[PDB]
Paper text:
Mammalian reovirus (MRV) is the prototypical member of genus Orthoreovirus of family Reoviridae. Here, we report the 3.3 Å-resolution asymmetric reconstruction of transcribing MRV and in situ atomic models of its capsid proteins, the asymmetrically attached RNA-dependent RNA polymerase (RdRp) λ3, and RdRp-bound nucleoside triphosphatase μ2 with a unique RNA-binding domain. All viruses in the Reoviridae are capable of transcribing RNA inside intact capsids (endogenous transcription) without the need of host factors, an attracting characteristic that allows viral RNA transcription of these viruses to be studied in vitro in cell-free environment. The ISVP transcribes its ten genomic segments, adds a methylated guanosine cap to the 5′ end of each mRNA transcript, and releases the capped mRNA from the turrets at the capsid vertices.
Anchored to each occupied vertex is a TEC, which is a heterodimer composed of one RdRp λ3 and its co-factor μ2 and surrounded by genomic dsRNA. We were able to model 680 of the 736 total amino acid residues of µ2. The atomic model of µ2 has a triangular shape, comprising three domains: an N-terminal, RNA-binding domain20 (RBD, residues 1–264, see details in the TEC–RNA interaction section below), an NTPase domain (residues 265–607) with a bound γ-phosphate group, and a C-terminal domain (CTD, residues 608–736). All three domains of μ2 interact with λ3, with a total contact area of approximately 745 Å2. At the active site of our in situ structure, the priming loop (residues 558–565) extends from the palm domain, blocking the synthesis of double-stranded product, similar to that in the crystal structure of the initiation state. These two features suggest that our in situ structure is at the initiation state. In our structure, the template RNA has already passed through the positively charged entry tunnel to reach the RdRp active site. At the active site near the template RNA is a density that appears to be the putative transcript. Our asymmetric vertex sub-particle reconstruction now further reveals subtle structural differences among the five λ1A/λ1B dimers surrounding each vertex, hereby designated as λ1A1/λ1B1 through λ1A5/λ1B5. Under this convention, λ1A1-2,5/λ1B1-2,5 forms the primary platform to which the TEC binds; by contrast, λ1A3-4/λ1B3-4 make minimal contact, as predicted earlier. Taken together, these structures indicate that the role of N-terminal fragments of λ1A conformers is to anchor the TEC to the capsid and possibly also to regulate transcription. We suggest that CTD guides the template strand of the terminal dsRNA into RdRp to initiate RNA transcription and the NTPase domain provides the required energy for this process, thus playing the role of a helicase, while RBD guides the template RNA out of the RdRp active site.
Author numbering:
A (entry chain F): 480 to 529
B (entry chain E): 779 to 828
C (entry chain E): 530 to 628
D (entry chain D): 530 to 678
E (entry chain F): 580 to 628
F (entry chain B): 2 to 1265
G (entry chain A): 443 to 624, 636 to 669, 681 to 713, 720 to 736
H (entry chain H): 211 to 230
The structure:
Amino acid sequence: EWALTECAQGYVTVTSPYAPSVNRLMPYRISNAERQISQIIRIMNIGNNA
Amino acid sequence: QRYQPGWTQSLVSSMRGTLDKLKLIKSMTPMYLQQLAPVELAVIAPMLPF
Amino acid sequence: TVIQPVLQDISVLLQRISPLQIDPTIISNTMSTVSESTTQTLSPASSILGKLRPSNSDFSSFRVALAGWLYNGVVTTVIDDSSYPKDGGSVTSLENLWD
Amino acid sequence: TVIQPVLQDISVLLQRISPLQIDPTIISNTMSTVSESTTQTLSPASSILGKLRPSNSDFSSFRVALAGWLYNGVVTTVIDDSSYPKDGGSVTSLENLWDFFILALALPLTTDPCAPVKAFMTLANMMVGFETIPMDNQIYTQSRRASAF
Amino acid sequence: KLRPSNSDFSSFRVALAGWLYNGVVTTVIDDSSYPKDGGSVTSLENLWD
Amino acid sequence: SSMILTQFGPFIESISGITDQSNDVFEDAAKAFSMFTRSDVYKALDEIPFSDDAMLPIPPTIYTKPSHDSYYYIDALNRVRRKTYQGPDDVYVPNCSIVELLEPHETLTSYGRLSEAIENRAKDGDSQARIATTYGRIAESQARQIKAPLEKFVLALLVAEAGGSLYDPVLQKYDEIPDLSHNCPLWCFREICRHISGPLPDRAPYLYLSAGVFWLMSPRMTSAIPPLLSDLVNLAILQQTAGLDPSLVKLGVQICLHAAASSSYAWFILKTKSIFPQNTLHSMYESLEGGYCPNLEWLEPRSDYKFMYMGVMPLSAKYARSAPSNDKKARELGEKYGLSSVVGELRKRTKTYVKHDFASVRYIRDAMACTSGIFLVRTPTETVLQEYTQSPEIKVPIPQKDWTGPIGEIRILKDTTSSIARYLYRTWYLAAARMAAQPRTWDPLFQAIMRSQYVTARGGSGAALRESLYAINVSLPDFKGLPVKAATKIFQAAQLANLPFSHTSVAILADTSMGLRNQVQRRPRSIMPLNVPQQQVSAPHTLTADYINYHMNLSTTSGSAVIEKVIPLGVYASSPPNQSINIDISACDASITWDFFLSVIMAAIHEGVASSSIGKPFMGVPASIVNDESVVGVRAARPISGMQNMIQHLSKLYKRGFSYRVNDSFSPGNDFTHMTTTFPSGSTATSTEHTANNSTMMETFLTVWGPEHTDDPDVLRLMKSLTIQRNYVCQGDDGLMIIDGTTAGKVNSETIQKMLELISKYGEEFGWKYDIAYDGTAEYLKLYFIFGCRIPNLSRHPIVGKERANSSAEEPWPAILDQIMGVFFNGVHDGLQWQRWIRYSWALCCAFSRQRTMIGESVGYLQYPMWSFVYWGLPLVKAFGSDPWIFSWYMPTGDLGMYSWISLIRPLMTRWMVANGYVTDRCSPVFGNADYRRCFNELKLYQGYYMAQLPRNPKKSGRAAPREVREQFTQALSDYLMQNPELKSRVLRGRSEWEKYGAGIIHNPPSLFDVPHKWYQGAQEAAIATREELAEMDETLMRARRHSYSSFSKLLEAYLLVKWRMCEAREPSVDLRLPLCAGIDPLNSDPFLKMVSVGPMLQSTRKYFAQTLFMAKTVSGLDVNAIDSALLRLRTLGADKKALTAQLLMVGLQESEADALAGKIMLQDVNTVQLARVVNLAVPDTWMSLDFDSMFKHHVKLLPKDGRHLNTDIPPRMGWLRAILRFLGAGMVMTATGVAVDIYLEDIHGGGRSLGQRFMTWMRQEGR
Amino acid sequence: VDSDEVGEQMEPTFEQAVMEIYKGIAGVDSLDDLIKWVLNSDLIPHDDRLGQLFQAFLPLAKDLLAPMARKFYDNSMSEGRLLTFAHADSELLNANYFGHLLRLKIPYITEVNLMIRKNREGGELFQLVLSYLYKMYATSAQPKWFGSLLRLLICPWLHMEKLIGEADPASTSAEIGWHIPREDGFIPYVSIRAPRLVIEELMEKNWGQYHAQVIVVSAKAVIKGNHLPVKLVSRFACFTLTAKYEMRLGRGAAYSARLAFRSDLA
Amino acid sequence: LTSSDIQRHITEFISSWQNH
RNA sequence: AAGC
RNA sequence: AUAUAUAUAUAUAUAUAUAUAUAUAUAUAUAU
RNA sequence: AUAUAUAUAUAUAUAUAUAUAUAUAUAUAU
RNA sequence: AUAUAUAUAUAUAUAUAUAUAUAUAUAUAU
């Protein structure tokens, strides 16, 4: 919810529950290096073709 | 009217009159809530199955 | 499902034990308007009547709210989000003020 | 709705008693004498006569305006929104000039206390960009509709 | 002179979008928008161009 | 085919682009057409060698049909009725054998009519005779619904298609439309006709004449044959003209055959009319691959309907079809009538299209074109007993404890009511209050216009008015000896000229006569023609509805012509990610009664008018006094205004009901009076009231009821995001809802589905049946849009069908030419293949260009030269040695098109003329040394041009009438019109001023004093013509033809002095690969090129032309265009402003604004379109769907490209020439085939001043 | 003709269908259960449950009663002028009833009139619910007092008796009826009583202007064109509001008819 | 025979257009 | 009879 | 028109996976 | 795998037959 | 008006035959 609220510059508000949980597994966080490598790959394959 | 631009007509008098009418209504609900409703709840409560 | 019948029944019992009668004609007479402002559409007196809709004759919410005081520990009464101003609203909108 | 028919009644009585009546042709007669070249794309007389359109039934609204003077305690006669230029106008437009002229002559007869401010702001709106003045804050800037004040 | 060819009206949004990818895409104005022979200030058409 | 080519070698070669056209060949072909016989046409049909693929089984069931006895019975009211076997709707003509009711016709023993002896027992009162005669007359009526005998159309098709394939001048190739050998409908037609005729030497199954129809005596003849033949010939024409896929045409033929083999052809067609739409249009693009979708924007204010085009957006699988699947419904419908196969192939073919291109829309259009196009016919008695016998079902009514005491007839509605009627009441209250406050309401001229609005030359049930007035001992003037119809509302007004309203008060409660109209793919519609006092008292309703529609909602006023509608609305709504909801009200007129609506609207209008209108008369209706009982206990009296008096009387009428009078001409002994509560359809307040209530109820749902009846948060958010001022457009019972696509794509279909269920539920509790369609398609006013492409519906323009509801005989000969030209223009708008369509239109024009006449042993032939059709707007093919197919049907009509094509081919024309010996010595500015004055005379070009302008209807004017009675009629009409003395004084002042100043400049000043004369002439022209008027026609046309001429009209001679210069082509307006109109594609080159060069008209025409006039509305009888033309003529000819003041005073404008407007007009500059009307220059009707305005502005350059020339100088005070010459440039550019081309003025022969003098001379001399 | 007369035209009358409505409501297993459900122990509808009662009942009425009522009224007009009673005007409106329509009210409590009336079929409470359903079914129109009808029905005759009570009835009597030539065929339409001068004035009127089709003692006819205006009778000469068609002393015929002033010689 | 298609009819004309 |  | 080089288009041929719906078995509620 | 012919099963349509329910006409009895 | 019999009409169900469409099977040609 923090990430989504910040990404929308506060114009939309999302809410999360506040209670004991069930340990759901939602793998979505990666280091910046992997993102940069994938970005380089994308720029590579797109390269020089309108 | 510092917070209502775009109102081409001066609605100050109308809004003030309506608010005043709402202010001084003969609503006896607050009387009932302040005096009788607690008595009714107290009478009913011991008899409940829950 | 377990809670619902209890609150509904207590609401009915309070409704038809109390001497209080809910009568919107008080509001209608106090405002004493049909449709002011012959030509220009903005008329706050008509707007507030439209928002209130006094003609409706259902008041289960009031009795249920009263009954909720006895069961604070298991049921929490809150105002439905649909009653809040649209998109947060603004002070410039006449309807948002009545909301 | 409760007070407006009273004003119409007073207007009818005034029209019944007053010796003043509309001159049918005075504006057209006096405007038909201005000199101009036929090669011009624009004609001031055309524009002014088009905006005026003296439908002879205007003295009813004149009379109700007069009657409003007796009841400023409860009724505040104001100029309708539609009379102002739509987007705010511009001094370079002949049509906007005539609209400003109409408003300038019409305003001083209303019972609205805030009339002079609107008379000033009417020109201020048309004059934006061409010529600037300091305003109070960021909300009621120089480009607000004059009727908002 | 203000009616665009095919009335596309879409180069504006594309130009705004291009600001995010100036690393790989360089938005330029096409040749066809320039005067054919370079123009002349004596010609009003060229002034508008 | 050998005789076909033998007879029409030269004609076919001319109209196929091989040889030059000429008048003599045209007339020879016309004579040949006139010299055939029916059986000869069928023998010609026998010679086509049909191929195997055009073969299909024909069930034997069609020929063998039972008798008609079991399908009819007699009710307890001694009225003939239809026995129903298939359900409540099986009230149409059954399929029964007929031959056993035919008396052989003299000299035509093979044919006969209904037995006259059976007619005798019918008029006596026999039951079986009545049944038989009803069946016979209704079968005759069903067979009479065509324009002309089918053999004419069939022979014309044969002649046209005998020329083979056409060469495309743009594509530089040959089209590949299969020849007649693959035309299945013709093979079926020939086979069925041969099987019916059998051994008997005559081939026509029946004979269509003006007096009726004669049936062939065969034991296999069935009443269902004529409609089947009409459908087959329509399909055969369409396949050859529009290049339809033969596979789909076979399915259409199968449907027609199944309809014939059923118990009732019309009922079957009605029940199965939706197979093609439900299987192609409503189930399209299930899996989407790609294509283009136009990017349109809706600007502000949306009330202005201002849309601007952006461009194309590539499509994707994200925007595949998402509406609920209709497979189960389609399969069930196909099974219930034994057409499951046809549904199977339709669905299988539909699934094959994955891309949105020209191909898919062409396929959809072809599929939709295969629906039958007959006019459904049924006896009036069943129509009345089926349409007026249903009533609204107010499932949740207004509580009775929510009303006040009565005020005369009305009853005020309280404000504490829990019903939704409160919002309706409030809306009508504010509408009435705003209406009554307008000063223009009290202007005498406005009231006069409203009074004159319903004074027309159409019927008004005057007879019932007459006995209603006699019921209280009041005698009306008879106007004995007047050669006019007494059954007109003009006659009613004349008889009601000088009566007090109190005397005519009872007339509103009179009866109502009958009136019917037949439609295509729709049940016949009934009409209640209200009389004059009813129309008078219905005014405030109409005014309030007009105010609502004009201000408080989004509502159009366009007609059923395709050009004037809002195409931008539909194209925007259909384009993704926007989604459209189609909402219609079933039996809308029957759903508005006193129970819920009328009791509220009448009260609201009556209350919302008292203030702004106290103590004033209106429309002739005076004030009055009524009882008051609103407050409890106190019962008093109360004055009311004229509008309130009308409201009281109209409330009385509404509470009582309606008294319909029926006289079934097809059923002896079937006449009665029917009490009904259905709202009238013939009144002036129908459409506006229906639209107003539509908008009000939709807004009420979106605002109060709907939010309070659904709990799903998605539905709540959606509904709160919708408002009528932004999303809903309504007109009558037809409405459209637009769902704007969100930023995340398009709104979820499930939410839309639940909302639709909510509207469906919401419609019931006040008795409205909401017919709702949600299938990813947009429909409005029977215009169909898919993905931003509009799909023309060919089936609703039957080529041969014509609506005939009465038993009257058909029209004289020359009238049919108007219908033929209308068919040509309908094909033009529908987007058929242009070359084939032009060839076929030429064939028809030839086939109908000759007529025998008898002048008392002076047996002559009336013949129209080919040039008259060209003057009427039909383009040429090839002439004067020019290249073929160089003209486009965007050619204007009248003088403009003539000038255009002469300007295009002047040099070739001159060389051709010289080479043929037409040589003279007097050099001509237009034709050099060509002897045109004689070549045009011998080529009949002058003759055709001049006779194309004669009125081809009989002029009933000039009939003998006593002076006294005629002057009484005129004075009565004038007295009725001129009620308020102020208007009369205004008109007198205008006449005096005009005599002082404007007299002598123009000869025909429009005035209110001329309205009675025009009304009298219109009433007289409404009567049935007689034989000597037809002889007058014939002798006039012969006189015109035999004469010799020397020039065209002055205007055309002036036009030919102007020459232009073509230049480089324009710039494309839209992308070349974006489908806009189905069929307008590269295989349809010329329309495609014109559309992409000019661009579609992206703004509605009604609002555009609303600003091209000075007076919005005038008195019925006068033309606004006439007044504008007179004013501009006066200004141009140098008359001073007092003349214009006088002219404005004649039409009744008050003096002050008269002067103001006169001065403003004198000094003002006007638009090109408005200014061009001084010379009767109107925009061609075919250009309406194109962006002609920008092409006027920035593509017709009045300055020569190389720089200023000596002759191209416009005198400073003759600036209107700038307006005229733009039209000439437009005609020249549009007439030429191909792309639009930038055009520059070249030279004017006599100089600008001379042209101006000639134009002014014509302007002054006209009107004599 | 009674209001309920349309009811028993069907072998299962409208009333038992109304009784059986209960099966379409959830939570109700019998008509008695329906009664105790819809009423609040004070014989008052809950103003909401009666809502669904109307929801279920209205289709029954508008789909079954209306057509049979239409035929019934169509046949009833054939025998001549009749007085028709109904329970809600919408019945007559939806049946396309022909003739003058009157809504009349009463200075009594109608609802209490039911449950005291013993010997009811489905129970008195069912009759109360039925009455509420009809009242909700009615349109929005102010009903006049019932006296406005009886006054017209009675008072003119009672006044005229003070004048004609002594004269010879042969002279001061009249008769209006449909004439049919082949003693002579004549079926009465309107009965007229008035003084001698009035009848003599009536004798010279264009009674032949109106035509009808008579079929055949129990004869019956049907009018074509327009009905007879009231002022043709008089503001005098109090007449009969209703009539029944019958032939006074043989094949079935449908010849024709015009009405004649066959009143009397004296 | 030679009943090839309608889509190819559409495309062939366009191909004629594009050629220059 | 045959509307707006 | 003949020959050569380059390119577009139509036709024929071949594979996987997944999801949805229906049906059978078991149970709860109402009815028998 | 494609084309042509034939047979069986299912679906729709038509016809015939049987059964049940309803109505109309004729006759007898009351 | 009621009861009974015969003829006729409508609805549902079943069966047979014919035609069309789908599936399955056989033969010839490629």
